[PDB]
RNA sequence: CGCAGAUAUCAGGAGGAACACCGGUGGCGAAGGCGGGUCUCUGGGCAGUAACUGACGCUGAGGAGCGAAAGCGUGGGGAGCGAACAGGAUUAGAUACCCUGGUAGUCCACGCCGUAAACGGUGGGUACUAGGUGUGGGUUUCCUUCCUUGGGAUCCGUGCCGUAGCUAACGCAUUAAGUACCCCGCCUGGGGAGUACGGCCGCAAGGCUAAAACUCAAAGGAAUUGACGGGGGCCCGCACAAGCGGCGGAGCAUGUGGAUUAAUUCGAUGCAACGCGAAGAACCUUACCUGGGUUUGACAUGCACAGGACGCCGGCAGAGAUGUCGGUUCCCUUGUGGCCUGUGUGCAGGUGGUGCAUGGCUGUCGUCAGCUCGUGUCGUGAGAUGUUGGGUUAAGUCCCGCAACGAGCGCAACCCUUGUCUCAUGUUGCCAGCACGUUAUGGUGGGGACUCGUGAGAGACUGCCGGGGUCAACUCGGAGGAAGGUGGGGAUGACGUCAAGUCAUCAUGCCCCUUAUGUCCAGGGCUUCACACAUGCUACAAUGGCCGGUACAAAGGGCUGCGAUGCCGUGAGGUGGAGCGAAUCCUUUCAAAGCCGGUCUCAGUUCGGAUCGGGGUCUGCAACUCGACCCCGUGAAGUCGGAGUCGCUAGUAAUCGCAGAUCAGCAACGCU
RNA sequence: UUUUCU
């Protein structure tokens, strides 16, 4: 990355839906290189949570996503022989790629003994909040307003 | 490992194979043959400088042709070398052995018989320095030839160390390919050990 | 230090030291030093008139005085600051660098000591030697406003840059380290030593004059290139940042360390050795250890004495070599050639030593871009310019002025592959369009209309346009095009450094054995382990284990070798053997993951498989140490992992397969 | 911050 910003690949769209989202999904959550298991997967779950709670999956989805989409996150940096914390604001796209991401760590590591219905599960408790995601969000934003005197510093 | 052969490096464009021949089954019998021969005739002959050694087999007739400085020596008179050698190939078992005979054009503007001179002219009593000197203007005094470069390596006038030493003048493109290098090698014998010498000549270029 | 009333703020009072803005490379004094204001006394300096004296001038051993801060005696005052000393915090140790407290002292009056890098490291006086450029003071003359750094002439003080000259160089330059004269001290190699004794001064601290023995063969002053920096500036790399998957916890396979053994043959030892030299250790390879033979010898050659035998196919004894016997015996031709049996003669023979002697080959700095030479010029000399500064690029690639003018190794190109098209081209290869098959598919007669495989040519050159640019390099964007600004990956290691690896590849100088450290064979070893490290596969379960159906590629190997169909085995494999020196016959129609159907509802598990027992196949004269494969019983550790640490930026990371190198048999999870 | 020895 010295000489420059680099170009960004063109992400291609879900067709069978009609939302990138879900090709993100599936892109985050391949595991060993295999595509067809990956969106098959994330098909059946998608339509469990559809089953499960009588709704558009695509809706819940997009309100699973403001509601855990983080705005500002915590940088470490250490000057004159001390580490110290610093608040910077973070673009929308990168938050709901980290979003995504955090979904992904919580939806494997939790116990209902089958993931298809448990990641399904999981959405729905992001969803309505009770989630793990949106308790990571929530300790994030406290770190960062706890660390916010730390602020001017600006990098 | 610094430098690879310029021959072998540039073998599929400029110079040609020395020995040609075709076979498969009989093919290491042949290889072991030849390359027999062709350590048998280097520690036979050394008064004579030989530059090169080809060698080409079709069915049970063989055919080896010879380039050396000079042929007094290499041929005699009467056929004394000549008959030596031939029966020699027959000891070895080449079959119908034919000899051939050919006479290098300009003496000095090849890199193995010039090795072999400045090893001699090392071995016996002449300095390096001098060696050098001679050699360089000899190769220069022709016109066809434009760049040599001559390196030295081993132990020098009978030093507990090793001297690693070269003199450049002229073409030394060995990455350009299109270049033409003309390598030789040769060891220089001494009464402390062994002196290995290196040459590299540049004779114009090649389109086509 | 406070919660007994702190910090903070408003009013008032007490007391000690020093004076910001003027204020500066400015002024004054001989040097030390000197600035809040007013008053009293006092020294010195410069300009002019030139009235007066009439050589009265410089210097200066001893001598006298002044003389930064620190310290001492006597007596006061003590706000702030603060040696010594207490504590707190870091460090392995802090008697310091950091912090909270604080006694001399810093002040005043009266006497003391008289020392500094008291440096402009350059004494005082006198007369002379090109300028330009600021600053303070005093007089004069003219554009003339006569205001005004307008300008002209002169004395003194203070800065910078500059010729002749001097200087070993750095440098000086009218305020000389320049040309000249008078006066005074100083020193003649470094330590010993500004030290000992004596003397003088002082209350003390202490200061002033200053020796000798002994010991060294250097000590120091200038300047040039490297190297180095926890110096600065300008830039690049998976170096970091955002991500992926790993090693370090379990089993197994290789290599090493460390300990035994008679031997576990030798070498390599961070980067740059540790799935190394071992692309295939039961004999061989091995050179290690025991034991049995051996002798100019297992194996070559030239000189004398003995000859035509040597060379070979078999029985007997033996751990084997080997010893003794059965069957053949010279090809040339008189000189002997070929060959070798017994005596030696030289000498063969050594993986015995020496990569600190070497040849050749090889790894890293690094695929980094730097590294040189000819002439000239400058300085004395080691040397410098070219290789400096600005702009630009992946690059010493290029443009601009410059004592430089040119060139070289490098960089790009020329070489391979991959991206397209055109032409040539039809068998063992494919089928456009026609006929024969009739379950077996171009299989068969036929056919270049495209791939198919191998020959020739074109195509990327900022090719064109708009803006930035010194109208130049170079850069952003746009159209055509397969590709746009080296399309992608490769072959391709400049001078040198690491006394880097390799006498165990080969050859090579020297030493060593020769009756052995050479040589043949029988058994054993390199696979031993109470531990450690490095690289890989299996995982640690559902993105999954298992069962049935089911479709998609590449390339290469095959003669004493691949091996068809068929038959018997669960399967190792057993019989057999079509087609093949190979686009044809085999390596299965080259599959795995992939898609559909069923079980498991999270267990030390239907995941996972090592260890230990009972049965067979295959190659080999020879499977116990010591090979591999098939069947069964056996059911151990292991639930994503500690600080630390590694690879990866597009067909990339991850995951699943196929063929080959060494090879009769494999240590094959390694390599290609 | 701190960071010994060849
Ligand atoms: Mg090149
Ligand atoms: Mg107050
Ligand atoms: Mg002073
Ligand atoms: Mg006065
Ligand atoms: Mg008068
Ligand atoms: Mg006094
Ligand atoms: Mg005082
Ligand atoms: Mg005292
Ligand atoms: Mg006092
Ligand atoms: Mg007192
Ligand atoms: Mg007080
Ligand atoms: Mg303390
Ligand atoms: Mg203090
Ligand atoms: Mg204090
Ligand atoms: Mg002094
Ligand atoms: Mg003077
Ligand atoms: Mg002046
Ligand atoms: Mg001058
Ligand atoms: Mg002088
Ligand atoms: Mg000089
Ligand atoms: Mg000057
Ligand atoms: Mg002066
Ligand atoms: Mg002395
Ligand atoms: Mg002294
Ligand atoms: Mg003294
Ligand atoms: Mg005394
Ligand atoms: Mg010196
Ligand atoms: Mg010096
Ligand atoms: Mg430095
Ligand atoms: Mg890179
Ligand atoms: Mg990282
Ligand atoms: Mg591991
Ligand atoms: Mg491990
Ligand atoms: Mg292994
Ligand atoms: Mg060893
Ligand atoms: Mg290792
Ligand atoms: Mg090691
Ligand atoms: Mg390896
Ligand atoms: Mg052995
Ligand atoms: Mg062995
Ligand atoms: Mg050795
Ligand atoms: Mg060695
Ligand atoms: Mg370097
Ligand atoms: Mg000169
Ligand atoms: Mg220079
Ligand atoms: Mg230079
Ligand atoms: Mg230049
Ligand atoms: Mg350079
Ligand atoms: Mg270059
Ligand atoms: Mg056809
Ligand atoms: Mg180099
Ligand atoms: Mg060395
Ligand atoms: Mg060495
Ligand atoms: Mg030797
Ligand atoms: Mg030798
Ligand atoms: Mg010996
Ligand atoms: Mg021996
Ligand atoms: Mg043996
Ligand atoms: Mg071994
Ligand atoms: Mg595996
Ligand atoms: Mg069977
Ligand atoms: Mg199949
Ligand atoms: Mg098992
Ligand atoms: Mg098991
Ligand atoms: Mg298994
Ligand atoms: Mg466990
Ligand atoms: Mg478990
Ligand atoms: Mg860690
Ligand atoms: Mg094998």
């Known amino acids: ?155 | 490992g610094q430098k690879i052969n310029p021959h072998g490096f540039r073998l599929g464009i400029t110079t040609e194979w020395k020995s040609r021949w075709y076979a498969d089954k009989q093919y290491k019998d042949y290889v072991k043959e030849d390359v027999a021969i062709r350590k048998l005739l280097a520690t036979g002959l050394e008064r004579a400088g030989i530059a090169d050694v080809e060698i080409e087999r079709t069915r049970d007739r063989v055919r080896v042709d010879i380039h050396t400085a000079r042929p007094g020596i290499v041929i005699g008179r009467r056929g004394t070398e000549a008959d030596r050698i031939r029966a020699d190939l027959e000891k070895l078992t080449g079959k119908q052995v034919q000899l051939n005979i050919l006479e290098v054009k300009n003496p000095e503007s090849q890199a193995q018989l010039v090795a072999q001179g400045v090893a001699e002219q090392l071995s016996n009593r002449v300095a390096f320095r001098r060696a050098m000197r001679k050699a360089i203007q000899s190769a220069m005094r022709q016109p066809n030839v434009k760049g040599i470069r001559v390196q030295c390596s081993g132990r020098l006038g009978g030093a507990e160390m090793s001297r690693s030493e070269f003199y450049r003048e002229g073409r030394v493109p060995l990455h350009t390919l299109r270049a033409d290098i003309d390598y030789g090698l040769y060891e220089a014998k001494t009464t402390f050990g062994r002196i290995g010498v290196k040459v590299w000549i540049y004779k114009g270029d090649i389109v086509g």
């Open chain 1, 1 to 155: 990355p010295r000489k420059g910003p680099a170009p960004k690949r063109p992400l291609v769209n879900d067709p069978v839906y009609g939302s990138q989202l879900v090709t993100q999904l599936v892109n985050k959550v391949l595991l060993e290189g295999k595509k067809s298991l990956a969106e098959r997967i994330v098909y059946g779950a998608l339509e469990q949570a559809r089953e499960k709670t009588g709704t558009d999956p695509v809706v819940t989805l997009k309100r699973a996503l403001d509601n855990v989409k983080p705005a500002l996150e915590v940088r470490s940096r250490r000057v004159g022989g001390a580490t110290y914390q610093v608040p910077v604001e973070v673009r929308p796209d990168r938050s709901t790629t980290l979003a995504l991401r955090w979904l992904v760590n919580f939806s494997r590591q939790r116990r209902e003994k089958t993931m298809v219905e448990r990641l399904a599960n999981e959405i729905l408790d992001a969803s309505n909040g009770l989630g793990a995601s949106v308790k990571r969000r929530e300790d994030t934003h406290k770190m960062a307003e706890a660390n916010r005197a730390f602020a001017h510093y600006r990098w």
